[PDB]
Design a protein around this ligand. Sequence first.
Ligand code: 5HR
Ligand code: ZN
Length: 865
Amino acid sequence: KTVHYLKDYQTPAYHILKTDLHFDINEPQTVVKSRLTVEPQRVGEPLVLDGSAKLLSVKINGAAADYVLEGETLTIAGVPSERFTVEVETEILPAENKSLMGLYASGGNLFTQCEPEGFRKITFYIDRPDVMSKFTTTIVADKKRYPVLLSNGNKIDGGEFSDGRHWVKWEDPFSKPSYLFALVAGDLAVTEDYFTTMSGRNVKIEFYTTEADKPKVGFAVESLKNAMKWDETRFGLEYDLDIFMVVAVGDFNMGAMENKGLNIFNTKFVLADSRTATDTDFEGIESVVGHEYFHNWTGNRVTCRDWFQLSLKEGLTVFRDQEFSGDRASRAVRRIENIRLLRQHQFPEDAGPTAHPVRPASYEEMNNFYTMTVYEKGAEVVRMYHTLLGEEGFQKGMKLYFQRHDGQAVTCDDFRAAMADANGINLDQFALWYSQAGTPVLEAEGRLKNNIFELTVKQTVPPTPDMTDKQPMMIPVKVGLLNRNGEAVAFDYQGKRATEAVLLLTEAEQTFLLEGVTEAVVPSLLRGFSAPVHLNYPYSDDDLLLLLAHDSDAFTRWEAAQTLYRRAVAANLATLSDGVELPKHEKLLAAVEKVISDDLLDNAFKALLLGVPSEAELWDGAENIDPLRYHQAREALLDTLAVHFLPKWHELNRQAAKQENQSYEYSPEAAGWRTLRNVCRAFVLRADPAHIETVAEKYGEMAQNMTHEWGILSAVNGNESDTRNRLLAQFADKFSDDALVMDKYFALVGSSRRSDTLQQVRTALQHPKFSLENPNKARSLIGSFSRNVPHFHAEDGSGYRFIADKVIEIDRFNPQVAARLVQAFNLCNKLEPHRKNLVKQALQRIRAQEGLSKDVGEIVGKILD
Ligand SMILES: N[C@@H](CNCc1ccccc1)P(=O)(O)O
Ligand SMILES: [Zn+2]
């Protein structure tokens, strides 16, 4: 079994200076001809090309080449000692391509996805990102079937053939790696706009969609123009072509793709209107449209030496899209949302069998490493440069990064060096954030003796499957102090008297002296989540209530609430296990009452403060887990909050409706009220499920946009009333022709806490709008079920068997979707013995499949072995 190792990296024996491509699109086959201008780097070595398409011919300098084709590699031993050409002819059947990698068909149209290694599915090539070439692409096709023919760069020629065909020629003047190649051919509607760069150059913007979906593309276009302006004002970065194209496609594996000048998007990150998209969907479009554009510099102009360096572009580009969204609106709230998502999804990864460093040392299948760790923890690592250096210093690093490496394929070490060198500071220890996996754990103690607050902090990083030795890391801990009345207390640290400081922990144990403290204090720690770590400090319940009510930092307030909730659930686990009455939670209920009644609070922030940690967060660190016990305990807490404050949930709902003020379009302000409203709806229907029939009677009046319909359907989704089923069926009927809304329907089917979810899911598999071969649908229904705790972790094992069945089935045509799905089983070793046994049986059965993909095999091996 082939494993790739970072320590084995070697520069390529050959460079490709020019890549000329010719696509002849017919029915059913597409014939691809290439002309590569190849430049020897290590003269005399064999030319090795990667490829898996059907090979028709290979030429060196016009003559039939002496070559051998073995597996997915073509080798030519006799190659010239100086510049030469290679010509390859391949044949593709795009309509048979259900992997959605390479050239494939969707909705009668043709699209490409080449990152990471899909280009070799199109032609034989040196398909690695440190090989950068200048591409020119000619496309020929039937004009009526394929009137729109697109590739990277500038369209420099085109014309008609008298047999109903036409052609175009695209020239991309920027050298690029193959993973950034894109082609689109089809009958697509176009929406046109433009942006003028700060140097005075118009950029034509073109969004391509189906004719029916064109009316839904407006918000994405506006978001792009906002992102372009923002990269100019915040980073000083300008676009470098006079054309920027975005193409939406409904069959797509990930979210979107940053192909130079020709971005290709999952429809879910381009299309919205208030009737069919939620406020959260809009925010997602804004984020991802920004993300892909920001890749133009962080990814395209400077790219990755090798795929181990993926976080070099993804961590940084995620950081950029986070800052973009934050500058647009609601910075504090949106920051909390990112932290929440990291701890809910990335922390369990770092604690599990597939844990890896932000920059992995090895991989079998690279598609398995487009992970929360590489992306979200990657972004947290980039943000720590910002925390250490400040915005000004961070931009100095960026400026030097581009000065040095524009046009190059580089490494995480080069980004760090740019930050270090531009600011004259030593960041050698910072490298460990790239090479050491696992969530660091801080233990802190505070004492006020004399007029100095003495904060002692230890750090440790647990062994991960790849590495036992973990050395102390560079961890910035932002701190402040509160007095008995919860106001900011000033202190002296490193010369400056301020109310806030960044304590830089670099050793296994350090003591920090905050001096000039003239009051009794409790510290506020890890403000703004200043490093991606666990922090344990001895807080009393009243310390937490004080932080929640009076602290100035959004994260620390939110973290205080999260802690009170965590403790309450732990109390529930204890009583439920002992077989006694539930706890009173008197302190918690008092704290929540204050939050509900506090009108100074941003409504979106209030909503977050009223959110309870997920089961996964709750059993983090536990062994021999019974997931249903954690579910029962969490549900009990939610039911107590629902019934206890039922009157106030109604009142808050009423206030939210009044303040929304019939403003049903997306805006950050309106969205905040609706978010709070939807929290209230969930609680109301927990306490009084019979309220569903009142809801049903007035459904039309309440369904003023999708945020409301989703909010309501989400709230009733676990209701055992027949009305729940009727409302869902009416939803499916209303939006039957909207694929993105049908995704929501299937998500509700799969995620329901009702007792009959497994059989409803199996019925949904046969719904005429469901397609297993469509990633959005597969993820919505099956993905949602796999995350449905009481059902996936059903004691009889029905959930495990069902998901293993679907991993096996899906892997036969789309290993990427299957390899993400199988990670539902990651908790295996931490489960109580009965469920553990059943999960291992499921994984063994997956492993026993003939022809199991490398993708799924890698994951299963990490869990099982
Ligand atoms: N670089 C992009 C990765 N998404 C595309 C992709 C990658 C692998 C397989 C299929 C699709 P993003 O981070 O979304 O900008
Ligand atoms: Zn990206």
